[PDB]
Paper text:
No significant conformational change has been observed among these structures even though they have different crystal symmetries. This indicates that the N-terminal toroidal assembly of the enzyme is quite stable by itself.
Numbering used by the authors: 18 to 702
């Protein structure tokens, strides 16, 4: 008989049902080996090596020490029994570098003498599994070296950086490179909010009627806003910087309440005149099929799922044969999937809404072996979301919602474009002796197209307009008169930059090239668990400890938390996965120093060991645990310190001949860092 090893029991039962008899299917429950987690994990043979606890022999080309987990040994025993009376072996783990490394570890652990076959697949269906089992491929050692390079890199990073965090910030603080970079993103946005200063600006909102000079203009009444006063443009929210002063761009005029009421008063009684009216046709192409990044984003905005929950649901959907592999950076659809989406599309929305030619959204992927297709429904024919809503009855009651999202996205990717018109409106009038201009913008939707099947949701904090929202304006002619219904002077203020959500954080991690489909949700979940970041509604808010660690790394180990260097490291790991870079050369280069890599990187600056040593002794600590905020109304610098009791406020005041003497207050997590202003600081003292 034949043996087949997978990672989870569900995958094992499904593959067992599809392969039939003559195949035995067992799971390995994930990884069977790992680096030593304690001194007791080191076998007696390696206890003579002083590097065994670290598990990496940096002086022997980073030779790792792989030990079988104490709870996993029994599993291996079972796998060592089944291999006795079978005549063939099949490693059916996931096709990414994780699953390839699991396969490699299984080979090193079991050491089979019968032929070995690695079968890969990105959907669990009977045709795809039977096809994969009949056409195997060789074990990609480059993927194994990429995953292994990541593991060793993380072990060395923790080994070199964790003690710094224990001595300078707080013990029991777990280190983490990419986590500290994403934490730096969030801390940077919070700092931007703290330094922000609002600025006031005023305009005039007008309600205009056109049913007198055009007794059939729909809509009859529309809105317009003041844009110019006697040739000078009226300031808006975009004309100020983060400190509240006008930008060094075009010349504008800032209005207040008295000026706006004066202009509206001098405008009442008269009429306005249409100066310009321009309609431009536009077409909107459908959204690409889902990948991990876009799936987590849209699942967060529309379904309020966290990235972790999205990936859990998507894992259960994938292993049960409902969706394709959820860890992909590809938006490609095979011909059968395209034909399925076009069939369901024509069946549900009609022939005019189908794209007249099959649409392909092929983009550059990081590795052609790890990602084949997009996240889409599985099979030659897509299971209807109602049938899936029938089968998934019980504890998992959102899986049908995620599945329906994927289905609507996939079907909508093969539908027709969305036609419409965009409208520009320039109006003029006379307030006293000053000419005034009233602008109005419009946008219609003549044909919805794919928008009848899928519409992306706007980010909650960023705000904006959806792709199917209409701002309809009547058809007007240059020189047409308009009647004024109301003149309301309007006041506004510049708003601070928006906080990140999980969706906008995932988008940032992808744009900066810092995250991969395998790491988004783990980055978010990890930075939330370790206490660096918490949630206010849907906003990510950094704690003060996150300020302390981010400040330390920024001030003394800047290369570790630089965005471009981190993205470069991810690109080099990917280059190892493709066989263009070698694990040994990269690890020597990064740890001990070399001549390869982007300028001024850790590898080009002496390596990780020497840089952590040099930068560690190059500090005097002192204010590492102090986050400077501002000064008070007497000139005393106020800052926040993180101690055993948590975050507390501190300043320095004189103290009767024995001056100075510090003053401390206590603050909980109720006050976000941007709310802790000078007034709030004085109230808490």
């Amino acid at each position: 008989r034949r043996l087949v090893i997978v990672e989870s029991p569900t995958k094992a039962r499904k593959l067992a049902s599809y392969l039939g008899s003559g195949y035995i299917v067992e799971s390995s429950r994930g990884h069977i080996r790992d680096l030593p987690r304690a001194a007791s994990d080191v076998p007696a043979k390696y206890k003579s090596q002083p590097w065994a606890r670290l598990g990496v022999n940096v002086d022997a080309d980073f030779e790792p020490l792989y030990i079988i987990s104490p709870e996993k040994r029994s599993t291996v025993s079972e796998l060592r029994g089944l291999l006795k009376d079978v005549d063939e072996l099949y490693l059916a783990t996931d096709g990414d570098r994780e699953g390839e490394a699991i396969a490699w570890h299984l080979l090193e652990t079991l050491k089979p003498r019968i032929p070995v076959k690695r079968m890969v697949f990105h959907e669990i269906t009977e045709p795809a599994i039977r096809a994969a089992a009949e056409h195997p491929r060789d074990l990609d050692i480059d993927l194994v070296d990429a995953q292994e390079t990541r593991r060793i890199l993380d072990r060395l990073y923790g080994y070199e950086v964790s003690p710094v965090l224990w001595k300078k910030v707080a013990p029991k603080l777990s280190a983490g490179r990419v986590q500290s970079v994403a934490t730096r993103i969030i801390v940077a946005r919070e700092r931007d909010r703290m330094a922000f200063r609002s600025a006031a600006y005023w305009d005039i909102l007008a309600k205009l009627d056109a049913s007198v000079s055009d007794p059939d203009a729909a809509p009859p009444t529309f809105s317009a806003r003041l844009t110019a006063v006697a040739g000078r443009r009226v300031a808006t929210g975009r004309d100020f910087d983060s400190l509240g002063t006008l930008r060094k761009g075009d010349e504008v005029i800032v209005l207040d309440e008295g000026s706006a009421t004066a202009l509206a008063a001098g405008l009442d009684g008269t009429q306005l005149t249409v100066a310009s009216a321009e309609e431009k046709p536009y077409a909107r192409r459908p959204y690409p099929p889902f990948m991990t990044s876009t799936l987590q984003q849209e699942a967060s905005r529309k379904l309020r799922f966290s990235a972790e929950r999205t990936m859990s649901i998507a894992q259960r959907l994938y292993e049960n044969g409902y969706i394709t592999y959820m860890r992909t950076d590809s938006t490609t659809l095979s011909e059968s999937a395209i034909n399925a989406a076009r069939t369901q599309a024509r069946q549900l929305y009609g022939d005019e809404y189908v794209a007249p030619a099959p649409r392909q959204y092929t983009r550059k992927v990081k590795n052609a072996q790890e990602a084949h297709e997009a996240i889409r429904p599985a099979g030659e024919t897509f299971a209807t979301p109602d049938a899936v809503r029938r089968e998934l009855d019980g504890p998992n009651i959102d899986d049908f919602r995620l599945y329906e999202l994927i289905w609507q996205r996939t079907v909508a990717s093969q539908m027709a474009d969305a036609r419409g018109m965009t409208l520009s409106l320039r109006i003029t009038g006379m307030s006293g002796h000053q000419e005034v201009v009233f602008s109005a913008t419009g946008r219609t939707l003549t044909f919805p197209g794919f928008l009848k099947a899928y519409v992306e949701t706007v980010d909650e904090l960023v705000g904006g307009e959806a792709d199917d929202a209409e701002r309809r304006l009547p058809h007007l002619t240059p020189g047409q008169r308009l009647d004024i219904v109301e003149l309301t002077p309007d006041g506004h203020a510049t708003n601070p930059p928006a906080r990140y959500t999980e969706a906008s954080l995932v988008k940032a991690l992808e744009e900066l090239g810092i995250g991969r489909p395998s790491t988004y949700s783990s980055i978010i979940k990890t930075i939330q668990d370790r206490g660096y970041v918490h949630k206010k509604g849907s906003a990510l808010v950094p704690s003060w400890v996150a300020f302390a660690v981010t400040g330390l790394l920024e001030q003394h180990f800047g290369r570790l938390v630089d965005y471009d260097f981190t993205a470069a490291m991810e690109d080099e790991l990917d280059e190892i996965a493709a066989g263009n870079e070698r694990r040994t050369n990269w690890l020597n280069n990064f740890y001990f120093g070399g001549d390869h890599g982007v300028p001024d990187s850790v590898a080009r600056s002496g390596g990780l060991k020497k840089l952590v040593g040099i930068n560690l002794e190059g500090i005097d600590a002192r204010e590492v645990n102090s986050i400077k905020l501002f000064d008070d109304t007497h000139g005393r610098p106020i800052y926040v310190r993180v101690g055993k009791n948590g975050p507390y406020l501190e300043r320095l005041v004189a103290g009767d001949t024995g001056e100075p003497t510090p003053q401390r207050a206590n603050l909980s997590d109720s006050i976000t860092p941007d709310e802790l202003t000078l007034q709030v600081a004085e109230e808490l003292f």
